[PDB]
Each structure stands twice: as C-alpha cells, then as structure tokens.
Design a protein around this ligand. Structure first.
Ligand SMILES: [Cu+2]
Ligand SMILES: [Cu+2]
Lengths: 620, 620
C-alpha cells in the first residue's frame, strides 16, 4: 500500500515484459541499472504510480537508452538515446568483468609480457577496473576497461599476494580489441602467499574465547509492517534498497507526544570514490567510483546469522534485476536489530538523595558489499536520544603492487617485495533534509575566542558565531576542527518553547578531503570530494554528486554544475551533501586480510525538543 | 606477591599505625591524599617494598606535611613541611564542603542577601567550589572555598533548577570565617522544577522496550589472578586504583607467540579541568580541576549489576583511606567485562571462492565518579587487534545560572529564565610508553600533498612526512586535522620482519583545546590544556601535568617547568601527555538531566606486528 515499499519480483518481471513488448529488450540489450523512482514532491499525492528508471546497454554497439516505465499502467513513459561521448558511459556490467581476462589471454603482446616473466597464462587473473578519462583520444565514446594482473598459484590461492607490476592493458569491451599493452619493466612477483585460512599461516586457532549469548527473550522492540516500514522507540521510517546506492532511508521521523515530526526525507550514500596516490603509470589512472561506476547494491552479501549479524535479527531480502530483466533476490541482504548501548544518563544527587541511571539503545540497519578485493559495511544507527549516525566499515584485502628496491614515497611495504599504494576511501552522504517540514536552512557554527579586557577582565570568556548560508554560491564549505566547526540545519518557521528555531547539528570527523592536485582528472570528476559540505536546493533530477553517468565522464558533472545555479537555500527545500573519508597508508597489520577501520558522521538534536526526549525511558 | 597489587585494608591500617607511632597523626591531623607509590625503575629492586605517599592537613592551621612511609618496614622514609603560599594547598577535604553552607547560614551579609530575594535560608543549598588564584590578596596561604546558592523547594527537589544568581561568598574553611559576600543584584530565581523522576514531567513511562539479555554460559574469557592481574586474548595488564587519578593501567603487554611484548608501562588520566566561559563576576573564577583539587577516585560510585554494568561482570572493590586513616572500601567500584564488537575482518573472494568472516570483541575496564552536579564515566578498551582506546562519558546535571533579560553571548537558555554557562571539559592522558621496551621516540606524521608536474604528470600522488621530536623543547605539538596529523611512538632498536622500527600510532579526536585568553589565570594554571601533545623524559617526580599541589596554586609547576630541562627524548624512556576535551554549549536537550556525550583517543599498532595479529581467531 505504501509508495515507498521495496520493489517486488513481480514488479521487475512486469517491467521486463513491458520493455520486451516495446522492442527495447532484444538479444543485444542489457539492463545496466534498474530501480524504482521516488514519488515527486506532493503532500496530496495519493494515486499509486510505481515508476522505474532503466539504463539499457547495447552489446552490438548501438547507442544506449534511458527509459522510464510505469509498472502501474504498463506503459513506457519516455525513452531517450544517450550520446555517451557527451554525458558519460553507463555503469559497468558484471558480465564485462570476465571478458577482460579472456581477451588478454589470446593477445600476443600480453602473452609475450607473461612469457618474459615465466608466468603460466592459465594462472594469471586480471582485475578489470574502470578507465577514467586521461590523454587517450581514441577512448572517447568507447567503453574501456583497464586490467592489472595477479598470479593465482592454485584455485584456492589469494591472488592479491602476487601482483605483476610493470604491466597494464586497456580493453574495448564492446569491439573486443586490446587497444594498448604497456610494459614498463620486469618486477619480481612477490612469492609469499596470503592465505589467511592456511593453518601454516594462522598457527593453532585460539581456544580461549568463550561464547557471548545475546538473546531477546520477548522478541525485539521494533515492528516491521508493509515489508519495510519500521517503528522503534518513537522513530518511524521506511527502509529502501536501490541497486546503485544500496540501503536508502526514507521518511525518518520522530513522534514527539502526539505529533509525528519529520527529520530527514531521504538519506543515502550517493557516491563513494577510492583514489590511488601512486604516480607509477601502471596505476596513476586508478580511481574506483564504487557507487557510480560499479553499483554497490548489486554486490551485497547474504549475511549469516551469528557470524555477520549477532542477536535477534530481522532480515530484509531485497529484489534486484539481472542484466536481462529477471528478478534476483539477495537473500538476507539487510540486517535489522537493536543493541544495548551502555549508559544513557546518570546522576547521583547529594542534596535530593535520588540515584538515577538509565541505559541507551540503538537501532541498527546494515548491509555489506564486496567489490573485488574490498569489502564495505554500511551502518545506519538510530539512538533513543534522537541522534542519527552513519558508519562505514572498511575491510577485505588491500590492493597490492611490487615494493621497489630502494623504497617509495607513495607505497607501503607489507611483506618481502610486496607493496600497497597509498589511497583514500571517500564517501558522499546525500541528506534530503525535512526538519519539522521542508522549510529549512543551514548555519555554520564556529567557536569564538575573546580577548581579555573590558567586559572580559579575567580572560575566561568564549562564545560562538553562526552564519546563515543563503545562496548555493556560498554553500560550499570546508571543515575547521581547530574552531570546532559544525553545521546546524534549522526550520526558521518551527520554534521550540523558548521561541528558538528547531534544529539538528551535524558533527563531522574532520578527516582530510581529496589530496590529488586540483588540476588533475580525479579532482575534476570527483569535485564533491574536495570540500566537506555542500548545500543545494532540492531538484528531483539532482540525485548523485557525480552526475547520472560517472563512467568515463570528462568531469564537472554533479555538484559543481548544480551549485552553479546559485539558488536560494534560506528557508527552502534543501539537500545536504557531506564528504567524509579515510586516508589509508597501509600498515603491516592490514596484511593478509585487513581488520576493520571506520569513518562516519552523526546528527544530534539542537533545540529540536523542548527538553530531553528520553525522560520516559523506564529503569528496568 | 605482585608489587602492583591493589592497596589492602591492612596496608592502609598499617600506614595509620606507622604515622601515629611517629607522632604525625594526632587528633588535629587529617589525611588529604594517600596513595601507593609505583616501583622505581629497576628490574630487581627491593624484592618488594610497598611505599605510600601521604599529604597530611592540620585543622589548627599549622603547616601541612608530605610524608612517605614503607608499610613493609614500618618506617617513615621522609616527612617535609609544606609552604602552601609557595607550592600550593592540599586537595579539598570532604569535611570542608559541609562547612560552607553552615557558616553562611549565620552570616549577616548572606542572610541580608537572601532576605532581599524573599528566600528562606533553610531551603538554600550552597555548592562549595574550588577557589583558584585571582586578585584577592588575603587568600594567599589560606584554604578558601567559594559558594554559589541554589533553592531546594522540598527535600527531593533538584536544586540545580533554581540558581540564585547575582550572589557569591568566599569562605576560609580553616578559621571558619566568611571573608567576602558579593551581591551584584537580584535576579529572578527560575521557578520550573527539574525533577526527572516526577511523573508530571516524564509522562507515562514507555512500555515498548523489550529486554536484551547478555549472558556468558561458560563465563568470561578473561582471568583475574593476584586480585587485579588480567589476562585476556593475548593482552596482559594490572588494574590499579589511586584516590586522585582513579583507575590506572600498569604493564600493558601483548603476548606475540612466545614473547610478552610491552606496550605501555603506565596509563592514567592525570588531570582534568572544567573551565567556565561566562564573564559574570559571579562565575568568572569557576574552574574545576576534578583530578588535582577534588580527587576523582574519592567519589567513585558503587556500580549496580544489570543497571550500570550489563552482562557477565567481574567487580573490583578498591580500598582508600578516609581523612583519619581508616580504610574505606568502594564496593563494586570497578566493572570489568568483555563485549562483542561487531565484525573484525571479512572478505568474499571471487577468485578463490573462499568466504571469510570473523567477529571482534573488546575488554572494558570502567568506573564512574560524581562531583556535585557532574557525573563522569572513565572507560578503557582493549581490542583483539591490538587497539587501545580511552573514552570519557559526561552526564549528570548541567551547571545553571539565570538567563539574563535580553540574552547572552556566553550562556544558553534551557527553560524560562534558566541559563547554562558555556564551558569545556578537558582531560590529560599521561602515557608512560614502553613500546617493546623503554627505548622510544615520537614522530609527528603529516600528509604531504604533491603538485602536478615532472614525476607526477597526472597530479594524483600524495605522500607523508615524519619528523622526529628529539628534545623536549620541540615536543610541544598541536593538532592539524586538515593534514591528517598523527603521532607515532616507535622503538628504534626493535625492528619488525621488514627491518622497520615497531610502533604505535596515536589518533586524536582533534577537538578544540583551552579557549581562555593566554594571559588568564586558568591558562597559566592549566597550561597543559593549551596544546594537544607534550613529550617529556621520564622522571619519578613528574607525575601530574599541573604538579602535585593544584588547589589555589598559581602557575610555575607542571608540564612547562618540566619541558624547560630540554632533555633528550630520541630513543629514551619517555612519557606522552595528550590533551583532549569537550567544548559544551548546552542545549535544551541537556535539561533536566544530560544524555551522555563522549570524547577520547585511541592507539593502533603501526608495524608493531609482522602481519595481522588476529589470524588465529576462530569462526565461532
Ligand atoms: Cu584502504
Ligand atoms: Cu558540560
């Protein structure tokens, strides 16, 4: 019944039949993206119209199309041919990955480079990686992948332990031509294995860990209705899933007494870029846009009870489409549970003799994805006190290279002859704000130091200042940890009982932003990553910080072009885009499989409530 | 047996007996501090000689004494008379707090001030606060407390809801004389109650929270031997307790195969300061040195099972001395338990076909203290992967004032007429490092951005730089979040298998440091708080960043005096002092009782191990 329900297998099958009958899904077509569209802005929108947006690829070389379908009326709403040399290529297809290694295996330059290094071609795995846009004019308008080679000594071997440095190949996966094979010189292939389930490497397994039993004897405190609507501890929201973005949170609201108060209309991680900082021509082109180029939702793991998710777990199994329009279920792809979160508030008062302690809890919504060697966990948290928090967890296997004799300023050594180039993992959170409604504004809050003198005779005073961001041209902001800079999203028309506008405060981790030179290709295509905070006026077609078609787009798409419109954002329908990330200089302890490292952000109420919202939590 | 065992009741009783026999603890004497001394540097030393340090106050006004005794030999080792006008007053005694309200209730100036406000003296509570050093010459060499008043409407009322602004009194607690009563004018006393257990303010309690049960059917995975020696998942340490610093960690080591490897010799929170930034003369003197002036261990709570500490809890009950030398047990004052901590490492490999998931856990050592309106939790965490983390949790009731008509730049409004002055909560971590032994050094690590051009033709490279701190004069460092700055403590004489010095990396939160003007009294007394990192050469008498006697002591002791020795710290026995804090602009949601906010730091291995140290964790 809800317009925000998860897509069903039936809806996807109905989309496939509609496209096929319209002549848009023949043998030479592939679906590169399929997803449901959000309802348009309308507080009276009640007529059910489930629409899907589809990117259709053509393997014979015809121009691709963007199609919008109504599953409701069974009609094609629009269909436009795309000029990819202008607006960018479609996302990478899972079936194009295997093609790279197959084509190189019969290419004579590739075989000769392998022969010089005495490598069996049957043992050489190729990582197929996105191409980017650099100085090669012949790749414009063509779908290119670039390949790096790794040796797999046997079928169960971890190939990441054995990079083949000095070698890279470019492949046109449409015409199936190897365009270039570049051999910069022979490097020894590192010999130690990295097999983290080999008893030879692990040693005897620990027998010292005792079980921790987390049970909910009366079931969980949250309810799920209509498939994906959660109610928990005065929170209300809908859990969506998109094949590009992954888990998406809709309609986050909080019941304050007898009022359901909106906070966030839509929350998602709308891009994620992994730029490498090794100047070697073998890797200086390497930049993953995991969300925009690869689609992180389509690689979500099925999550195992007790291993991946511990406690009383409620699962969602979302449906996506395969490349032919068949529905595919990601069984146990989203975990939902609550967990204890320690002390919430505590005071023992000498004067009143009252001793008071209450415990905190958080609601957790999570999924995990695997893109090649990397694995990323996406965690959304809701706390009793109104805090909302996101956390990314990075693990998997680091990407490797040779470690050069004489060292490197841009690569860490992990094992004899084995290196790991420096890189970053940078996320963009898109937060379509709705603090008590859609009339919102953003203020930047800095700490203000004061000088000893008149009115500050003892030199103890300090203060704070707030600056309203009024237009998009002034709403590109950077962090300043030294002055405790935060950002407040308020509703100037909804006041608390002290007649102050209600608000929420964004707390960033203040990690470094994109380190690449400003003139570089990655700084142009990942412009969002150069600044900590962006604010735009809402528009329904401004969805991703990097534009709709990220793969092999020349740059400038997404946020820099949106911001150029210089729209009013002072008491308007606005969207907050927060950049945050990890700068990873790999350490020996990250090898051969990396312990989790985390980064995130959180939002806390700032005069949104008239007093603490957890006074009604029982002692238990 | 172990020289780091907790002080026993018998030892404290013996100190009492020894001081009495020596004529140092007659009826007019009071114990203001009593603590066990750590063994001096020496592998062998005195078989065991348990020594105790005592500060002895005299209630007839005679000069106090610092005394060291050996409980083993039954002897006084040294006893020195203190000139408190020069070196500082002793910490505040618990029995002195009660003096203040009782003395004011008979003072004609105080009664006249309350009569002017139509207040009944029998309902006026006085918060007795540390005095600091300002422009009052008659206070030099006297023990002074300052009092701020709050109305309690009935015996169970929260007095913090009803501050009596415009009024402050100064009291000599030894001669029992009210030195000054200052009245800057009548403010309305805020009328709303702040009683967070009153059903009329909480409303009906929630019935929606279902139980979370956390059990360990085979018991915990750690062992406790010798009363306070912990072994847990390759970690080894001794948990100490001191009445000034609270929980102290000794001898933190990690068993790496055959070898027990030292990491940290002694870890403590060695000072904490809470400065207020309201320039009103009623409060511009307000700064708490909770550790140095009040002794935070003295006010440790007894922690309730299932409420304060949830799960399979092992308790320690430390023993301290009262003001007369009798042992007092802080029952269930320390909780110790292990917690599940989500995913440790995870990878699904396409090429090998192996799926791999491991879970993380942490060991938690915690205590809570209550000082007036404030409650602080101190948590130390040890993780499976070698990470060490500290977290402070701040809750309780915010300190209040009137909210002036027309507003304030230095005070938040919480309720009609009720204000909360801006303030900070700043901690100093003293980390006596011992990375694989005592030969250590600190490097400051910054990210290095690189310009596009020769050798970096695509503008993607970035790097890092490390700067060795070689002398104490250059070891006073500030954060730089923009350049990702961290600090590495390494042992230049212990190399990993890649022939690199083993190390640990300090990750700060990069919160603002002390905001007060550099010429202010608080900036001089809390000089440690103005910089993020200090490194000193180890010395037995350099224990606290503010010095031994903080109460009513001007600047001239502590970290700035230590650093002036300019000693060699490059490959020596060194101590890291890390400043970190919260800057608190109170919000409406902090009233009437504050939900927990947090700050901390962590240390992670950086080439300390030869590979990941958690390959031998089993799959459950
Ligand atoms: Cu990484
Ligand atoms: Cu505070």
């Amino acid at each position: 019944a809800s317009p925000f329900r998860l897509a069903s297998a039936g809806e996807i099958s109905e989309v496939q039949g509609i496209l096929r009958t319209a002549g848009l899904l023949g043998p030479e077509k592939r679906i590169a993206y399929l997803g449901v569209l959000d309802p348009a802005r309308g507080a009276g929108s009640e007529a059910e119209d489930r629409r899907f947006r589809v990117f259709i690829h053509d393997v014979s070389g015809a121009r691709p199309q963007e199609v919008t379908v109504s599953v409701t009326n069974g009609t094609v709403i629009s269909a436009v041919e795309l000029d990819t040399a202008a607006t960018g290529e479609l996302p990478v297809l899972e079936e194009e990955f295997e093609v790279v290694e197959q084509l190189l295996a019969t290419d004579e330059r590739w075989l000769k480079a392998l022969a010089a290094r005495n490598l069996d071609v049957s043992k050489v795995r190729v990582a197929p990686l996105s191409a980017g846009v650099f100085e090669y004019a012949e790749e414009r308008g063509r779908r290119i992948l670039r390949g790096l080679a790794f040796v797999q000594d046997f079928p169960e071997d971890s190939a990441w332990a054995h990079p083949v440095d000095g070698l890279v190949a470019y492949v046109d996966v449409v015409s199936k031509e190897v365009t270039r094979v570049i051999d910069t010189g022979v490097f020894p292939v590192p010999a130690e294995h990295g097999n983290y389930t080999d008893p030879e490497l692990t040693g005897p397994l620990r027998t010292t860990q005792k079980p921790i039993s987390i049970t909910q004897p009366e079931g969980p405190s949250f309810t799920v209705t209509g498939g994906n609507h959660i109610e928990w501890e005065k929170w209300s929201l809908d859990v969506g899933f998109d094949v590009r973005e992954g888990v998406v949170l809709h309609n986050i609201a909080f019941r304050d007494g007898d009022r359901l108060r909106p906070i966030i209309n839509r929350a998602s991680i709308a891009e994620m870029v992994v730029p490498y900082g090794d100047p070697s021509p073998i890797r200086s082109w390497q930049n993953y846009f995991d969300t925009g180029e690869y689609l992180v939702g389509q690689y979500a793991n099925s999550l195992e009870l007790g291993c991946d998710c511990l406690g009383d777990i409620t699962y969602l199994s979302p449906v996506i489409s395969d490349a032919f329009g068949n529905p595919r279920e990601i069984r146990n792809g989203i975990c939902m549970h609550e967990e204890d979160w320690g002390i919430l508030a505590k005071h023992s008062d000498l004067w009143s003799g009252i001793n008071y302690t209450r415990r905190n809890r958080r609601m957790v919504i999570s999924f995990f994805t695997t893109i090649g060697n990397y694995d990323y966990g996406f965690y959304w948290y809701l706390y009793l006190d109104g805090t909302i928090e996101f956390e990314a967890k990075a693990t998997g296997v680091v990407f490797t290279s040779a470690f050069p004799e004489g060292g490197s300023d841009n690569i860490s050594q992990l094992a004899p002859g084995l290196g790991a180039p420096f890189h970053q993992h940078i996320f963009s959170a898109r937060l379509d704000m709705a603090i008590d409604g859609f009339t919102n504004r953003v203020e930047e809050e800095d700490v203000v130091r004061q000088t000893m003198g008149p009115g500050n005779e003892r030199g103890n005073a300090f203060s704070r200042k707030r600056t309203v961001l009024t237009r998009e041209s002034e709403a590109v902001r950077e962090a300043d940890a030294r002055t405790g800079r935060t950002w407040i999203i308020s509703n100037p028309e909804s006041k608390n009982r002290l007649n102050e506008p209600v608000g929420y405060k964004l707390h960033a981790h203040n990690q470094p932003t994109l380190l690449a030179d400003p003139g570089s290709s990655i700084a142009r295509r990942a412009a969002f990553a150069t600044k900590d905070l962006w604010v735009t006026r809402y528009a329904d077609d401004e969805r991703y910080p990097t534009g709709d078609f990220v793969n092999q787009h020349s740059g400038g798409a997404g946020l820099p072009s949106y911001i150029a419109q210089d729209r009013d954002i002072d008491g308007q329908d606005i969207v907050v885009w927060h950049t945050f990330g990890l700068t990873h200089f790999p350490r020996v302890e990250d090898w051969p499989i990396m312990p989790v490292d985390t980064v995130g952000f959180k939002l806390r109420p700032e005069g949104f409530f008239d007093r603490s919202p957890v006074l009604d939590v029982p002692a238990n």
